[PDB]
Amino acid sequence: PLLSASIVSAPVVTSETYVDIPGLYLDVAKAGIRDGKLQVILNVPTPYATGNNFPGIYFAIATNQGVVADGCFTYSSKVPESTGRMPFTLVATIDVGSGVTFVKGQWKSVRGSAMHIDSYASLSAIWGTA
Amino acid sequence: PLLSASIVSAPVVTSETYVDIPGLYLDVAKAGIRDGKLQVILNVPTPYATGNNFPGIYFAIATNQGVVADGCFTYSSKVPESTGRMPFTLVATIDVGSGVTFVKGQWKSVRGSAMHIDSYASLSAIWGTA
Amino acid sequence: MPLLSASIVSAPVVTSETYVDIPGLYLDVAKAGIRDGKLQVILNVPTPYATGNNFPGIYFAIATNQGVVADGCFTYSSKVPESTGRMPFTLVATIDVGSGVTFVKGQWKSVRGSAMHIDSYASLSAIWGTA
Ligand SMILES: C[C@@H]1O[C@H](NC(=O)c2cccc(-c3ccccc3)c2)[C@@H](O)[C@H](O)[C@@H]1O
Ligand SMILES: C[C@@H]1O[C@H](NC(=O)c2cccc(-c3ccccc3)c2)[C@@H](O)[C@H](O)[C@@H]1O
Ligand SMILES: C[C@@H]1O[C@H](NC(=O)c2cccc(-c3ccccc3)c2)[C@@H](O)[C@H](O)[C@@H]1O
């Protein structure tokens, strides 16, 4: 039992709080998963951030109970000569029998960065047992 | 059933088109997979690129039908002081019942870059159902 | 369909010329009753950084009781980075349990004397299957 959602682009976003990346959503309930474990992979292979103060993006895996895992990339220069593509992957294993109905990908600005996904990205899950 | 192929190095390559990374090939047919879903992970943990115009590498997951997912890393300087190692992971979920016999890893130059893998890299797949 | 996972929210700062264990990134394959088959292992360190004076970086490894099965690194592209940016890292290996594997662990080693930092979420995961 394999869940997968993929996008080829997202709207540009700037946010001080975690907001949902449109299209990176897995309905666990719709697949009739009510117990057990999901290994979740948020894969954003070609993201970039724009800004004037060491830009970056915070990414999270979230369920109906909140954020379960988060991370980020940041550039190593204040004003990068060019905002290079910086691959990002996040892996978390969640318990469904806690009352999980959904899994989603979120993002949040680092230091006011504008966040960009303009190519393929994916949210995936494999089901198993404790 | 768990598919896996790993390499410890590849030849240096420059290409304006996607070409196959030698050794990163999964034979779905030989494994007797003709239906269902594969979650594929292309993992190139220690790549780098060389060039004079903001180097990088494009990576793709491809089947007998073509590319199903792609991404890249790029540096953030035109002529990096040193071409740092830039980890890359791509994840895609494919339908084997569409006529898939193989899954392979490909790469393509960014702006004429020379592409380097000189350490471990892997192409993996887990089979499941919808 | 057993799913193994270990996660941390931080580790101690480390400088090491040799691979050392990242505390908390450990999977007991035996205790889970796995004695045969294949594990697909993912080491995920999404927000690491390194500090140093000479193009800093970190080497990461997946290891078993038999030794290292896979390794990689990130490195910065400047000798003395203006700031040590967070550089996401993932390593994927598929191992055989029936060779005498009891455990899987995450390791790290300095690049050029770097100090190694994990101060946020990181994970070691495994999915069991067969050839
Ligand atoms: C923000 C810039 O984005 C550039 N990339 C593009 O503008 C671009 C244009 C067309 C296609 C793609 C692309 C294609 C396949 C997969 C991902 C991206 C990138 C990239 O090369 C630079 O280093 C920099 O990060
Ligand atoms: C291109 C350069 O490559 C260097 N890497 C090596 O020269 C090197 C030499 C021996 C072994 C390895 C290695 C070992 C394990 C896994 C990956 C690479 C790297 C690296 O330190 C620099 O920052 C830079 O990106
Ligand atoms: C070493 C620096 O680390 C900074 N990050 C932090 O200091 C920081 C502070 C509080 C929280 C977090 C964090 C939160 C969620 C996930 C990961 C990290 C980072 C980062 O923005 C910079 O670019 C740089 O790499």
Numbering used by the authors:
A (entry chain B), B (entry chain A): 1 to 130
C (entry chain C): 0 to 130
The paper states:
To solve the structure of BC2L-C-Nt in complex with 1 new cocrystallization conditions were found, consisting of 17% Peg10K, 100 mM sodium acetate, and 100 mM Bis-Tris at pH 5.5. The structure could be solved at 2.55 Å in space group H32 with 10 molecules in the asymmetric unit comprising 3 trimers and one protomer along the 3-fold axis where the trimer is obtained by applying symmetry. Electron density is clearly observed for the aglycone in all protomers, while in some protomers one of the two structural waters could not be modeled. The two benzene rings of 1 bind in the narrow cleft of BC2L-C-Nt through hydrophobic and van der Waals interactions. The two aromatic rings of 1 in the complex are not coplanar but form a dihedral angle of about 28°. This orientation allows the distal phenyl ring to burrow into the crevice, while the vicinal ring interacts with Tyr58 in a T-shaped π-stacking. Considering that, both, the benzamide 12 and the naphthylamide 11 have negligible affinity for BC2L-C-Nt, the hydrophobic interaction of the distal phenyl ring of 1 in the deepest section of the binding site may represent a major contribution to the binding affinity of this ligand. In BC2L-C-Nt, the binding site is found at the interface between two protomers and is more buried and extended than the site in LecB, which is shallower and solvent exposed.
LecB folds as a nine stranded antiparallel β-sandwich with a Greek key motif and two β-sheets composed of four and five strands, respectively. BC2L-C is a hexamer that displays a double sugar specificity: the LecB-like calcium-dependent C-terminal dimeric domain is specific for heptose/mannose, while the N-terminal trimeric domain BC2L-C-Nt is l-fucose-specific and binds histo-blood group oligosaccharides, such as the H-type 1 antigen. LecB from P. aeruginosa binds most compounds of this class in the nM range, whereas BC2L-C-Nt from B. cenocepacia has a more stringent specificity toward the aglycone of this class and additionally only has μM affinity for the best derivatives.
